[PDB]
Design a protein around this nucleic acid. Sequence first.
DNA 1: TATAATGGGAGCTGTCACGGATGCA
DNA 2: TGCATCCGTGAGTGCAGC
Lengths: 111, 8, 105, 169, 170, 220, 52, 1112
Amino acid sequence: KEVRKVRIALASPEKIRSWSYGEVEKPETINYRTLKPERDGLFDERIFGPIKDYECACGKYKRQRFEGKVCERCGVEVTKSIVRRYRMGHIELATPAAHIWFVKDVPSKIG
Amino acid sequence: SDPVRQYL
Amino acid sequence: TSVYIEDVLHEFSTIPGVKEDVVEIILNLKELVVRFLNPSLQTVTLLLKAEGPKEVKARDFLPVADVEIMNPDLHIATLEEGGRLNMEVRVDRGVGYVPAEKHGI
Amino acid sequence: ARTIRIPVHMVETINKLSRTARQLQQELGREPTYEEIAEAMGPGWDAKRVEETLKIAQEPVSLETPIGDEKDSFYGDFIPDEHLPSPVDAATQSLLSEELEKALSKLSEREAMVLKLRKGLIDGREHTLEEVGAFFGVTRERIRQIENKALRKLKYHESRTRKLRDFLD
Amino acid sequence: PEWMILEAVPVLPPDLRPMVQVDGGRFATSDLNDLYRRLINRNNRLKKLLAQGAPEIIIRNEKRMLQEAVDALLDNGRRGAPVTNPGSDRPLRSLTDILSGKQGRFRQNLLGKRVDYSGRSVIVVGPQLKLHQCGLPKRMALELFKPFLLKKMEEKGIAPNVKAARRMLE
Amino acid sequence: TGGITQGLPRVIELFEARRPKAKAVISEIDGVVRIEETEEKLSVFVESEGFSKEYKLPKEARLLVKDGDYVEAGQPLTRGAIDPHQLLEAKGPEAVERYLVEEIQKVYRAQGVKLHDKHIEIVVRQMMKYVEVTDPGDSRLLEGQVLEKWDVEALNERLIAEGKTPVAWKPLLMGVTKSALSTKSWLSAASFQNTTHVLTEAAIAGKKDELIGLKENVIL
Amino acid sequence: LDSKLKAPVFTVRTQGREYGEFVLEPLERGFGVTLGNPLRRILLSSIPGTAV
Amino acid sequence: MEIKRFGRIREVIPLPPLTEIQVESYRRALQADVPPEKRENVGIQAAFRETFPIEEGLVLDFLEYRLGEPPFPQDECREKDLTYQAPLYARLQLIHKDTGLIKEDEVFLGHIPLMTEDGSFIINGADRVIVSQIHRSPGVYFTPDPARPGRYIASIIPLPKRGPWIDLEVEPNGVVSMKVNKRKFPLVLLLRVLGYDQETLARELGAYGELVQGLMDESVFAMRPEEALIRLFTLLRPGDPPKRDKAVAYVYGLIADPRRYDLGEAGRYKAEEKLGIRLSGRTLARFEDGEFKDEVFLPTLRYLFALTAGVPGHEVDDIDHLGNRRIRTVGELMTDQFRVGLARLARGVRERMLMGSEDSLTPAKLVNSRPLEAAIREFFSRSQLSQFKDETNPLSSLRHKRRISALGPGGLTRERAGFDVRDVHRTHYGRICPVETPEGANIGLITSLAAYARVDELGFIRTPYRRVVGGVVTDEVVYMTATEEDRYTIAQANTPLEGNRIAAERVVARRKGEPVIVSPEEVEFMDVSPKQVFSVNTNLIPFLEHDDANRALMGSNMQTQAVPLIRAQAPVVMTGLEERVVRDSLAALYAEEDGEVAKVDGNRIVVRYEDGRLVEYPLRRFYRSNQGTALDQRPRVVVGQRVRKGDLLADGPASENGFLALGQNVLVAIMPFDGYNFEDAIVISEELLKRDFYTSIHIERYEIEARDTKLGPERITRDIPHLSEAALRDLDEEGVVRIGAEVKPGDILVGRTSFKGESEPTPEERLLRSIFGEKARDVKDTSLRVPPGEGGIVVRTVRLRRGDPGVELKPGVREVVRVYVAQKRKLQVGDKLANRHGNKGVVAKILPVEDMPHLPDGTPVDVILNPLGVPSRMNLGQILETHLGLAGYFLGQRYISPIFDGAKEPEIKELLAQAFEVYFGKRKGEGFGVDKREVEVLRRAEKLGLVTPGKTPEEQLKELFLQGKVVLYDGRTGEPIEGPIVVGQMFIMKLYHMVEDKMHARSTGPYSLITQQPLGGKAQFGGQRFGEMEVWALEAYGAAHTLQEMLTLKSDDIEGRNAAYEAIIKGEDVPEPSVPESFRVLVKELQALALDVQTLDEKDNPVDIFEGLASK
DNA sequence: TATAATGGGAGCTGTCACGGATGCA
DNA sequence: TGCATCCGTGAGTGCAGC
Ligand SMILES: [Zn+2]
């Protein structure tokens, strides 16, 4: 189909979670010794996808034709690494927090 | 205004 | 069309005991006027060997058959005690202005 | 405190190395070498260990780090993407596949297919001799032999047309 | 309306906030990672302080800090002092910063872009040129038209193939 | 030195439809001019048959009026640039269009720049693009709600065709910036300026960009 | 340094006895005006003719 | 050759040392030569004295400091990328008050950068310059309130980062308000804190009736100094507990604390002079005997009320006046950052003092030098005032050191900058050059110190004048500030003198800048020279008085950009300043004392002096500058030559026999030529290239590192995979290209191999290599190659390795290799040429010699300049320069024509007459008469009224020659130019803007990480920016596909750009564009802002631009 | 894992004009 | 209800820039 219109709207928590491929539970980025991403971190391949094309983290499945497959050992989907610029993660807050755009923008929409 | 002041 | 100097790898170098740098030496050698007698002769390599203290002129070039320098008083280099200069300079027949960049001789 | 997290014992070792180097520089009137720091750290510590410890201690720098006296230049603007294949690389892989298929139509169906199976052009995995042999219904020795003759014919044709040479860099 | 409050804060794909090894093996990364790390640290500490039955002053402080963390992430310096990295006065670059301004996504990468098959040089008067013509330096042309030139080199005996032609022009 | 500074100033002022500090005082209605000047204070009255109006101005102001003269509504009483909005409420849209065009052209002519009226007219047209509702009629609109003239006209033609009460509206003049931020396409506006504002209002409204203009299509 | 190249080809375009165009290429640098000017001077001043 | 100089004005004093502004400043700051006990309270010593003693009971005190010798010399620092610096030790003693225990030790604080002899620094191997800052001098100012006329603002301003600005204003409600940290509060409260009784304020301020009544508030006087203090504290600190000692602490720190609040010494002086009082300390008040005592506040209030009332002897202040604007030089800036780092070190000290063990604490354990080191390093690296030194030519450095900037920390930002400060104030006379400033955004913000100008100890720029008593002009020279200068009537430097007495009935002078005609009885002072009005650069423009200022600016600025030429020559027409510039810049090498030359070498000059000692001078040879210009010194003397003191031993870059040589003297004709000189373009003769005029040496440095990785070590080797021996031809055994080899783009400078990551060899590639029998290697070719458009001869290689003596690299680096490549650049088409009068142009054409316009004697011109560049530009100096240049061509002489005391038309006419005789009489003797073409041209000129009818051809030719015009022959025809043409010698320079550096082109190349758009810049092999306005151009043309290509296929559309490249190499037309990646980046970045952006169709149904990859 | 210890610390000053809110007289 | 007044937001392009 041809793109005609472009819509922009508020995103519900449900929508945001629908976007997310996983929750990031840890501040960690990459391991100091290995320089690999850390589990449940901001760079996690489990959440955001494989760093290498069609190859999981542990290296159990290295080939295409293993598509959509998820490794049991490392939990990483085998697919194109391009998805690392696409798939969103999320952080579940203990206390709800106001989006500052709808607060500090005068006149305040919430206000 | 100043979070530290408020907390103190 | 060309200059070789012993213990000189390129134009950007200086020689111990010689006042002029190589850029200046070549600039002076570019003023050299060499007459050929025999019309059949295309090229001549002028050999120069000298040591100081002396002021090396174009006259100091070792003579070649059917070759006359029309400006023997032309300055080449200034050599100092311990200063030693050994050159082989290639002079060719030709026409117009051909830059070093083009002929690469 | 670190964008790249470091274990507490390792942070202790790093800070200890820092304090050691600082004292050493305080008595040396200059920054110490790796060897002097290694001396002051005790046994088990050589220059290489100090050097690698300092290496792993290095913190990352901001991509938004400003460049120039104006506000218009980021440090990250100078950093190329090595991951995504260049148009040249992509086109080269494309012409490579197309040319290999040339030689495909070249060798017979069986030997070309055996080669594609063993080298992984089909499912991407590289099959063993027993798999291609059980697939074509022959012995592993036989399938190995037809693989050999396939590769051999490819070698001859390659020496002949010099087509696949330029892709070898 | 309640969607103007965030229960779950989205996380940008990592490639858009890269952690990259530069030439020398040293690492360079986007500020968004530091912002997200502040956020996650404060959130986690909040969950642990809750689970452990902390007094109200503490939980209040933590919640306030959490809101300010979210603020810093989405629009930094919008309310209160801008969050900076240790040992620097430089404000961290948040999503709002990324979007707007002259250096923002729209103006920099969207309404305009750097392009391929382009070059530049000094200009010199053309008096012999006809109105529809310009003098173009040979080498500039060799580079700008390069793929066409590879193709035409293959169309003739100049090169066996495209890759050979390119390796030849190297 | 020896024998477009001002120029650019004035132009920008005009294209931003800004109320000048040099502002000339204009008559809101028709009438006859009765000047009343005490040595200490000066004032100018405009007297119609039905009613009279009073304009109190500093005694040092230059008057463009002779005592006992009949002045049109919106006609300058004093020198200085006219407030385009006052001219709008007084003499209407065409007057303002003519004023903006001629005024902008003065500056360019002064510097020896030959430029066609058309372009300035295009811009001014974009400046007049909006209206403000005086009464909603039978519509869903609100009093003081700003919208596009085309939209209120289409609406009113639908209401008239339906037999309903038309929307009472007044012409609205805004400067180029506000007009650009007030455009229908949210991609265009958000990429222009005030990104967060445009984006939040659009997101709350669930705005759809129909990709009518050039900017949007460029962005995509 | 080495220079050897071919002699130029003389090209002729003639319409009637009234007009003609004469093209000589390639020539060494500058020789276009070296030949052109003297010929123009001669063609205007020295060509035998008749007059009243 | 003979140098003839014009002008009657005799300069009483020479130019002061031109780098003194840097040198004496930094020397004053360090006090390294001063034995510690004799040091003053200024400089880094001041910072030590402010920081220490450190208390809170342990007490750390400061005895003295010392600076050691530099661990490495300047050159070695340049090569090893080190910093020229000296170790800084500080002797400290910890004293426990109770115990009485005193532990004394000298602690090492790290290093401080040393300034070189020429007034520059070496930071990490690169030469830098700290640029002087200009700012508002601290003190008490009174300025008109812009809103309400009749009311004024009294501003009390301290030094930058020295505490808050304080405003005093009379409010419409009648009460006097004080503003501090944006807080308006009644001043009477603070007045009460200082302990002022209503009676004292009444008797003091009573003289002004209406105002003091507004000052009176009984609710304040009903309080006590304590209660008032706590009240003020509650006003400045809401929510903060109003404890007594805390309020005392805050108010003391805000006003009376010398460490927190500092007016400069200059602020002190100016406050004293303005308010007519005497200041004890540098603060606004004191804490004495338990209470506070006022200093500045009451006098300020008194003055403010007096000005408001109209009381005589009270005026507002001109904040742009150069009496109110001072300069912060290197010493002050460096000292400032030193003070900051020291403060941090002190904080750390108090920390350790509280935490550490009470039995044993040494000063060494208490002091961490790191924060201080960081502060200094930060200043000399990332500061805006710390700039990469401009070494392009010696004058560039000299001028850079003399720069003044209104920008930087504590300075203006270009947004806040507006006219009033970019203006040129009358007080700039003799101080700041009115001419040399940037044309663009920095105009008036970046300026230049005038030639005779000096910065005093207080930081004010002073210019010399001469005492005039009874019309007699003394040799006594007095340097005044602008404030002092305003007090006198100062005569112009050109006022006619017989002996030391002024002879004119009427003289032209200045009184407070105002031009006035006065009698000699009224003259108090007289200018030293016209030179003092301008900068060092502007002073290099001959016939300056004939050039419009706008082009003088351009000539000035462009001289900085002149490239040193191998054949470089001094101008035929000089200003007289050419030698001092060479000398002060330390470019040339000179003889220390009278002596005899022992040895002369390319590399060395050995001199034997009167002392009998043998002093050897090494010559810097083909060294690379910051801008890549070659800096080399050549010996100008010979063996056995006797040299007196201050004699020239050797010429540095851009120096011909000790005279500044910025370019060549070329023979120009001013005529249009076949459109090739159209719009400032320039035509030159190939003869210039033949004789190597405008040829310059440039050296470029390349660098590569081989480091330890986790995939295995990178290594520098000659063994490079898949490479022939043809490519390794010039590589040595170790893999580094050999000295003397010629390198072209694509050539390897240094061989390097790197191990491949998981690049799981494409089972595609597995197959490939197996077929081809060649096994897939594990290493790949990372070697450093000559970038496109570069090359030359390799003149140097530097190889540093880990495990080598005296060598330690940054962690992980196994080895570093540098390769220095030199190139000889001939002048070419597109290179920028300029003269000193602001005439600039790019060379558009190089003709063979036979095509050049020539003189009747067969002499071709060098350069053809279009006359159309003259009239609108109004720089006639170049014309005069040409005329005189013509004379000196035939007389074989050079001239000195001082600015404003010049060569005049009649004198040039005389010289031109002599020159004409030389140019003609020779012909007449040679047996040749006047040419037919000359006759025709004479007829033409006779119609133009250039020559008089009836005179002989010779007489007329002379008549033209006196006008600087000569008959000129077209080289292409032989027929003469119909009019006579202006021909003569002009000094023209080759500017640093060279097409060889600027020419760039790209098909495809590296892309950015996030945006996937092409990188910018030549060095990165980047694409040109097609920006919003270029887009507007394409839109305006209605070319949709060209535009869409720009937005997609050619930039960030991945699939699109790939498919496009492949399509083009195949010969297919380019495929249809796709979504540009940065739009996806936009969508995902908006999602991160919790906004849902949906691409929809006309059915309002969602469309996936991420193609399922983003959806679960 | 235990002597007692109980409210921070750095401010940043030379724009400039407009739109739009908000408050106070 | 009109008018201070405070806050927030803008302020040319491409080169290079360490
Ligand atoms: Zn796995």
